[PDB]
């Protein structure tokens, strides 16, 4: 239900040190 | 986990440790998917080749943990297990097909900044995210290198891309099924890393670019050594076995 959202990261609009690398992996060919 | 790095704090608040009660021993990783429900690899609980055959009473989980070489007062919660459920088509004789199990907690755990459930993928989440070249995250307190049958102080994390089904099959003589996927960098991709012995039952998770939620796509299952050129880690395919998890969950 309210799963998948980390109190210390998403719920505080804060990003971990390597989460952009995963999103970049989706856009790259 | 090999060639990973220290998790930041509350980076993986669904991370669960699975222990033997006596003598107190860290067996495996797990993942929290509800207040009552913990998910792990079937071979953490039942593998007759290692005369391993744990019941509910034999075991205990520790949730919200970051260091094993600390005790984390008013942060980490410990829970006994009411029932263990192994996939009825779990196959240890051959290739660890459906290497999945569910443990139900005696008391529902309290959610905190350090304890929070991971989502399970739907149809579309599996379609959009479980594709070759797309990167998920693996975590655990497992072995630091390949060795014979590497304990780190801090929870370990590595991002690894999913690998095309044909390169997975070419890597190994072990028969793989639809209920599994493989992840890791090709030799001559330049990056490295892998799960390892001890990391089993730990989650392979991906961040949906649509709703910002973390989903558990895989369970650390098997490999040959850890982090070898031309080998990849094999993950239990969480979507293909979701209906079973649901039968078990929709039935208390
Ligand atoms: N990603 C990796 N490089 N390794 C992951 C290994 C994870 C651990 N799994 C294992 O050690 C599993 C269990 C049976 C033997 N095994 C293996 O991974 C065997 N080395 C290969 C194998 C595969 C299928 C069937 C038989 C043997 C868990 O801690 C239990
Ligand atoms: Na893409
Ligand atoms: Na490798």
Author numbering:
A (entry chain A): 1B, 1A, 1 to 14, 14A, 14B, 14C, 14D, 14E, ...
B (entry chain B): 16 to 36, 36A, 37 to 60, 60A, 60B, 60C, 60D, 60E, ...
Q: What's written in the study?
A:
In this study, we investigate for the first time the conformation of the protease thrombin and its zymogen precursor prethrombin-2 in the free form using 19F NMR. We labeled all nine Trp residues in thrombin and prethrombin-2 to interrogate the conformational properties of the protein in the absence of any added ligand and Na+. We labeled all Trp residues of thrombin and prethrombin-2 at the 5 position of the indole ring with 19F and solved the X-ray structures at 2.3 and 2.1 Å resolution, respectively. The nine Trp residues are distributed over the entire surface and function as effective reporters of the conformational state of the protein.
